[PDB]
Swiss-Prot record, chains A, B:
One of its GO terms (molecular function) is inositol monophosphate 1-phosphatase activity. It catalyses: beta-D-fructose 1,6-bisphosphate + H2O = beta-D-fructose 6-phosphate + phosphate; a myo-inositol phosphate + H2O = myo-inositol + phosphate. Both FBPase and IMPase activities are inhibited by Ca(2+). In contrast to mammalian I-1-P phosphatases, is only very weakly inhibited by Li(+) (with an IC(50) of about 290 mM). The gene is suhB. GO terms for biological process: inositol metabolic process; phosphatidylinositol phosphate biosynthetic process; signal transduction. This is Fructose-1,6-bisphosphatase/inositol-1-monophosphatase. The keyword Mitochondrion does not apply. Its EC number is 3.1.3.11, 3.1.3.25. The lineage of its organism: Archaea, Methanobacteriati, Methanobacteriota, Archaeoglobi, Archaeoglobales. It comes from Archaeoglobus fulgidus (strain ATCC 49558 / DSM 4304 / JCM 9628 / NBRC 100126 / VC-16).
Amino acid sequence: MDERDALRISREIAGEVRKAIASMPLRERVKDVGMGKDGTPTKAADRVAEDAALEILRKERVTVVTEESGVLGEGDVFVALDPLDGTFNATRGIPVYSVSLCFSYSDKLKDAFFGYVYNLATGDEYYADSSGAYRNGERIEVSDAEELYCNAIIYYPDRKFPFKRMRIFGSAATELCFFADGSFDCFLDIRPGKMLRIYDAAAGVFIAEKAGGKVTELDGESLGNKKFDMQERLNIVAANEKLHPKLLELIK
Amino acid sequence: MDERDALRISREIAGEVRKAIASMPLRERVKDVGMGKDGTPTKAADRVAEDAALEILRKERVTVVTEESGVLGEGDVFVALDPLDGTFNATRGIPVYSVSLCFSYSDKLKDAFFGYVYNLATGDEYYADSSGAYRNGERIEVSDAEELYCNAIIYYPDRKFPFKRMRIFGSAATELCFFADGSFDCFLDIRPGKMLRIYDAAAGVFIAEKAGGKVTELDGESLGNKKFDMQERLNIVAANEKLHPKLLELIK
């Protein structure tokens, strides 16, 4: 498989996933249907979403990692999948939630060749391959935000901070694409618990990097060897080249 | 003018403003045209929305209160208007932005008789009146959660909090409706630098209260004396009756 195929498959899935959820009323959406492999409630909206995506990835030779079902298949191309990133918003009808797809030629983040995040409430399509990163077919780049006095997305502000704005929308994949296109100056998940997961973050991170952002763990080190399995966890500091060090500086 | 005239007027307004913004590209929305009564810039999105609103409004016997154009007119129904709350979101295609209107029978919030918040992105309509609070014409009520381990919108977390989730979406009027809804268990604007202005607070305050919430100043003071005219900005502590007393202690 290659980048154009991943892009064709991802679009297949988003189209099918968006119709599975769009026609499901909030009342149906919010009901628990099971417990995820990941340990949290599977909501009905997650499993309808998760089901439309699996019927596509099934016909392809891959190893998929997902929240509800977990590790699946035995293909050489690994897929980190969040069929529904922003479930809480979806169940509440808040228009910020996405499908997120990251494909890798190995079990580790550093071998990623495609990343895709599709917001299912707006039709906004974000992706990245070798030719760069795009929003709805258009080239995107991080901001040239060199001041600390900037627009941050952060999980979770814990103290006084110097940001012009602070936002938290409930969809990490999607907010990583808000960083990537330059609509926010940085993204931070510095929760000491290290609560962000690999299917949640991998499409976003890769996309953010293709758009020029620097994307590291808490301490500035590379995420390159993050594993596409259920037990991986991460923290994230992401901003352009000049701003990134100041941020690391800030939180240290 | 009565609560029924107020719904009719709000709806036509929602229509014009929805029409105009929907027609302009992001690159346009974001231009500074640009100086309003607070010293914050007026973006092209802001002006177009205001113009559409005001055109409809001051055909009425009203005093308009807006940040952009300040206090307009001399009629004695007072209308707190913000034609586009969530401007930063709107200019980047992030779909949480609304037109907000609160009609009172004096310049004081306590004489409020109608509140109206329309999601310009999604078409969600919230309103309240002496009959009750609605979302897309279905009556609503606030959650009844009683613990601080709840779902909170909060401008801004500065210390360690016990909440189950914290969110910050960039449109206080919409966000007070998320609370009004039960979607979120509380709404907190505790910023030491009380920045919230009455025209962004009044309607969602109005709707949340008709939906059963307790909504007061930061120390628990009543909001009925806050005025549609000027200089003072709000702090807000919004929650069901059982959680509100607890929130007041916590932000001690």
